[PDB]
């Protein structure tokens, strides 16, 4: 009895909303003066330590598929890539038909994945036509009609090509995302979380942990690891799904190399503009390749199958190589050092299962490429200048982007896929959700205000 309205300001209560997050970073590169394609372009100073607060007695929903910030990650990474490529040289004067022949080196009367070529150019603008020569990995090139000595760069037909300036680095840096004032970010700390439904152990932060913007396909690499045993995340509107994300509790090492020496050459294009064509290949010629501990691979796919049959309770599971489409999805792909790789993963995925460490070492063939589509756009493409000398690289596999075949009697089947870059960031942003605080609460109370 005897109750009246009262207003409380600052009441801790919230609702879900779309909101513009801040890009945040270590304040200059890895806290260093180096030039790097992410953190050298703005993205504000360091979070020294995220001030995580664990909420008592909160039950709250999360939905990693319908998430409001993955789109912003996708746009922001694209924006940094656009802003950083924009000043660099457009290779447009290079784009006309090349004469080409078999490429070679001393004690290598062929280099097989490759072609030697020569082309018309102008060394200074409105000066005389001039001839220069270089070799290209064959995948950068198309052959014009007939038996044909005539070839062209694969994208300069359809799109403008920009050379990425050799001053930059492709290296990822640990980016952070932060709330603007009056928004808040929630983590969901339950160590078994499948990416949808309620969480029962929840905490808030002004910013995410670090995320590394690694471009990759088929294999999630240099990412986080799951806290439980292996977690399998899918949508659950339908058995039909675009991607399944498998998140490992144990990293599998992969090592890779481009062992041939590269002779960089400089061909002028204009005032302060130089194109780093790929000159003579040096050393005892090999393919690019990668290596894996076969014990760890077998254990990993056994564990993955042993979890995956919990979603799919009928008898048989099977893995296979890619069905078809572009190199970008039909192979595993990544950017070790400063060149792009494409690996025929078929020997990793020939495996089968049913109801009821430096030995046997797996090694895989890789091709490499200089002309690259990004974000699956068209009309713009990137040329990678050659990295001089020879290259070694090591990274951690952390998860698989699977997709599932047609369902048939007693038999599921899966293969590597994904390739749409959003699924990489969704494979790590699955934790977070963003909310707006609505602080102006009202309630009944056993009081009234004096009139005097």
């Amino acid at each position, epitope marked *: 009895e005897n109750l009246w309205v009262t207003v409380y300001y600052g009441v801790p209560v919230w609702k879900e909303a779309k909101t513009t997050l801040f890009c945040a970073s270590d304040a200059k590169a890895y806290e260093k003066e180096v030039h790097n394609i992410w953190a050298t372009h703005a993205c504000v100073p360091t979070d020294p330590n995220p001030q995580e607060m664990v909420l008592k007695n909160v039950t709250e929903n999360f939905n990693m*598929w319908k998430n409001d910030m*993955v789109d912003q990650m996708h746009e922001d990474v694209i924006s940094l890539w656009d802003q950083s490529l924009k000043p660099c040289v457009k290779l447009t004067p290079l784009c006309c038909t090349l004469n080409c022949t078999n490429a070679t080196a001393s004690n290598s009367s062929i280099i097989e994945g490759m072609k030697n070529c020569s082309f018309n150019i102008t060394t200074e603008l409105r000066c005389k036509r001039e001839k220069k020569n270089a070799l290209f990995y064959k995948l950068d090139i198309v052959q014009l009609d007939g038996n044909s000595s005539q070839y062209r760069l694969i994208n300069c037909d359809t799109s403008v090509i920009t050379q990425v300036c050799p001053k930059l680095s492709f290296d990822p840096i640990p980016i952070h995302y932060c709330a603007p004032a009056g928004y808040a970010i929630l983590k969901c700390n339950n160590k078994t979380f499948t990416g949808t439904g309620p969480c029962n152990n929840v905490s808030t932060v002004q910013c995410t942990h670090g995320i590394k913007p690694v471009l990759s396909t088929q294999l999630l690499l240099n990412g986080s690891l799951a806290e439980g045993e292996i977690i399998i995340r899918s949508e659950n509107i*339908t058995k*039909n799904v675009k991607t399944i994300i498998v998140h490992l509790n144990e990293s599998v090492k992969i090592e890779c190399t481009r062992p041939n020496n590269k002779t960089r050459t400089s061909i002028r294009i204009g005032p302060g503009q130089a194109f780093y064509a790929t000159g003579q290949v040096i050393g005892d010629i090999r393919e690019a390749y990668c290596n894996i501990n076969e014990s760890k691979w077998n254990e990993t796919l056994q564990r993955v199958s042993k979890k995956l049959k919990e979603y799919f309770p009928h008898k048989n599971i099977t893995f296979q190589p890619s*069905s*078809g*489409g572009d190199l970008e999805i039909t192979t595993h792909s990544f950017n070790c050092g400063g060149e792009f790789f494409y690996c025929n993963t078929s020997s990793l995925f020939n495996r089968t299962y049913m109801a009821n460490n430096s030995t046997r070492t797996i090694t895989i063939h890789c091709r490499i490429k200089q002309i690259i589509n990004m974000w699956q756009e068209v009309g713009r493409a990137m040329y990678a200048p050659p990295i001089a000398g020879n290259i070694t690289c090591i990274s951690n596999i952390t998860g698989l982007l699977l997709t599932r075949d047609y369902g048939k009697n007693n038999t599921e089947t899966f293969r590597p*896929g994904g390739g*749409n870059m959003k699924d990489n960031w969704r494979s790590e942003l699955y934790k977070y959700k963003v909310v707006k605080i609505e602080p102006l609460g009202v309630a009944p109370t056993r009081c009234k205000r004096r009139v005097v």
Partner: antibody
Amino acid sequence: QVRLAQYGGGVKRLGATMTLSCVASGYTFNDYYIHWVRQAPGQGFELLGYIDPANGRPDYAGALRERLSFYRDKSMETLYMDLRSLRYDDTAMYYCVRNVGTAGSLLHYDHWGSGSPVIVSS
Amino acid sequence: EIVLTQSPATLSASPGERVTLTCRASRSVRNNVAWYQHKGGQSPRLLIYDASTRAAGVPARFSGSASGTEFTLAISNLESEDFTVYFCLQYNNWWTFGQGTRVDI
């Protein structure tokens, strides 16, 4: 606004190979999966498979995995379906169809192309 | 392969009547079902999806509902537009269509 035009329909010789084709317009070509579906006369509709236009990934019905192939000329917003080694029972209407989906799941169809008839007899 | 059965195969009706079409599945498909009108010799059109959501620009006379493994399409007023073929489609697992149903005089 949107369309799926089609071509390639007509009489085809017994045991031959054909490429049918479909041309999109009016929407963001990377965002929607395309499905190839057919109807033989006196039969209910049937799915051949689907293709993601963005990366060109195909997927096929288990009965036809040997005979079909899909590809796209992405700059032209244009898709092609090969069916190898035709038989009398492939005589049907063929459609390309647009499929809606969230980032997680493919769902219902929302737009059908003009349809191409095919008749298999020399 | 999830089967859809439509019933009846052909439905006898008169103009301005309310009319009901039925579809059943060999096992559960949740609500992940849709209905299409198929005008003679033409590209089909979407009516309803998720067994219940009428799509944009579709006539308000169409409606639908579900119970377990069974799905129902209704039309409030038959017309020369609608004395035609219709089919149910499911997208829960794999895609599969019913044999279609014709509505006639």
